[PDB]
Design a binder for these strands. Sequence first.
DNA 1: CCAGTCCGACCCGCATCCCGGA
DNA 2: TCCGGGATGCGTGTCGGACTGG
Length: 411
Amino acid sequence: MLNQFPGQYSNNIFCFPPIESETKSGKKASWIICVQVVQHNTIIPITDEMFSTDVKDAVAEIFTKFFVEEGAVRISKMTRVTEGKNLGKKNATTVVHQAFKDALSKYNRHARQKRGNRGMIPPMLVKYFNIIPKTFFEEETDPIVQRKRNGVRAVACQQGDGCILLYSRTEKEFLGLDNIKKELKQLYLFIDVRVYLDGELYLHRKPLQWIAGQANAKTDSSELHFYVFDCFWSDQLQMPSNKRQQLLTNIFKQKEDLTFIHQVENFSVKNVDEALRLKAQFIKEGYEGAIVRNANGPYEPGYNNYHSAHLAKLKPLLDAEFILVDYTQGKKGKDLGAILWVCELPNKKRFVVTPKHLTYADRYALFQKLTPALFKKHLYGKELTVEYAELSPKTGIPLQARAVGFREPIN
DNA sequence: CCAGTCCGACCCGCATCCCGGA
DNA sequence: TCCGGGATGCGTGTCGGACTGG
Ligand SMILES: [Cl-]
């Protein structure tokens, strides 16, 4: 019935069981997902026939409640379920059975990358972009520069049963990279089985889109390689980066004859100009950039997507200009009503860019106030500068795109 | 009083499943 | 059978804001 779903029904509201993660500062945090039943600015009971038939001018509103160990308590701007989906088909979800599976999805998703997950640890993420905090060189040992490969990141560890567990940055297990997993098992017969190996799934001269497809697919072509750049034990996380790289180096001397598993090569540096000279080298060899790691930096897992300040990536930030043609709007929660641009290419294929340095207070206005009559007089045809990481190799659309501003500025 | 977290949305691209119509 | 739409959930990531730890 309705109790298919975990949680408690009270006060016209069904909130799911709290999931509780620990903040980096050691404290306990709680997070609540809840659903309501608004009709004409009012709250209504919870039936078992809103899962069967829709009530007129009745929408379900899903909101989130997050709070610390009793500090301030947020409520999120409601996300309005106006309709169901697949309504003509045999999978027609009414607007409440759908809101209750939309919220239940967020329950299963939100568990990962927290402090639990089969014993997986989220990999460490870098903080600084084209910045090397000068404290990296003010230590007893020099930092390390290695290349950065435009691929999908994966962590390998051996579970108790002896099988190989290869998971992603959000703690999702990769499937069917059997060739890599095969030489991972052979390798684990010679090393401390409690070790984690941190690297990038990658195959040189292949786009990121192709590498991403091979990883997330159940079946696989078994051509990818695994380039390990770091290792750690769940026990000793404070082990400085310089030490971890030295054990990893001898891990790969326990077997120097593999096809799909290779250790990322390490370079020691004493100034910024050495790193950039290596960074320039890496991009001409075809790679994405360079990674700099503080010598005495611990391993800080990416819980709640936390980015460690002991790492930096040096990578070209690409800018170009694209013809503005139209405007649009977000669709869920806080972005409901926020402006988004629509650019267009020579080939005349269109895409969306989120503006930058614009308050949500602004973006609500520039969507409500703008009119096709007004827009056309002032903004249509102008050139929008877009920052991006790379061009879509199959459409030329800039991916990871941001709108910094125009060439002929406006308001 | 901040710098530091953490959240809650989002681009495009890809993989898969379930759907019915051909 | 194949060929879609529609929906979902991955990946590389993005940024604003609302908090909070020191
Ligand atoms: Cl390398």
